[PDB]
Amino acid sequence: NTPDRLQQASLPLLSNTNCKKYWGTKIKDAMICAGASGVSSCMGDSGGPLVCKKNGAWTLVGIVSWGSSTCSTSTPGVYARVTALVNWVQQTLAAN
């Protein structure tokens, strides 16, 4: 059930509003949904990246967080929304 070799998968970002349709009130501003596309992040994926490519480089948009307890490929995966937290990151590096 657990892979030796690194896995990858392309998936689309959802809007929080649309995401709330699946998860309701569990969805907070600091969260961003992706998936519900035939792929799913799963146990052990947590903390890993959700990256989007633009102007040639990959940007961390999300952090694998939670989702379907079954890793259903038809339910959106929930990631920590990096934009909502990047200020904290930068402050933290700055001060340390």
Partner: protein, 131 residues
């Protein structure tokens, strides 16, 4: 990741694995620079865990990997365990990662950056392929 595909070895250079004392991979991470890794707060990382960079095949003994000690865990004060909100933790490494072709950092966005619904992105990791 369920319904994923095997990545080109070393093509996701920021991808790190969080391992316990027993060598068990329990979470993923992303290098943002040579001294810091971004991960999820719920990963519950401790300075007893190790950051593993440059891995492809966690089963291979022939890869040039870097097992990096963690100097300090920085859990976002906004993190809410109950709702899993603001699920982010920063790990300051004791010794800096040696960047190479297979070990490098991901970019971070600006707080005002827009990531539009419908945009196709990619997620990577050693999580279950089958629940």
């Amino acid at each position: 990741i369920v319904n994923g595909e095997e990545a080109v070895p070393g093509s996701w250079p920021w991808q790190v694995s969080l391992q316990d004392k027993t060598g068990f991979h329990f979470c993923g991470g992303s290098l943002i620079n040579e001294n810091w890794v971004v991960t999820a707060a719920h990963c519950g990382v401790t300075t007893s865990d190790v950051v593993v960079a440059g891995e492809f095949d966690q089963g291979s003994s022939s890869e040039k990997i870097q097992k990096l000690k963690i100097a300090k865990v920085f859990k976002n004060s906004k993190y809410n365990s109950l709702t899993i909100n603001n699920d982010i933790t920063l790990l300051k490494l004791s010794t800096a990662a040696s960047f190479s072709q297979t070990v490098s950092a991901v970019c971070l966005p600006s707080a005002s950056d827009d990531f539009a619904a419908g945009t196709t992105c990619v997620t990577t990791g050693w999580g279950l392929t089958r629940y």
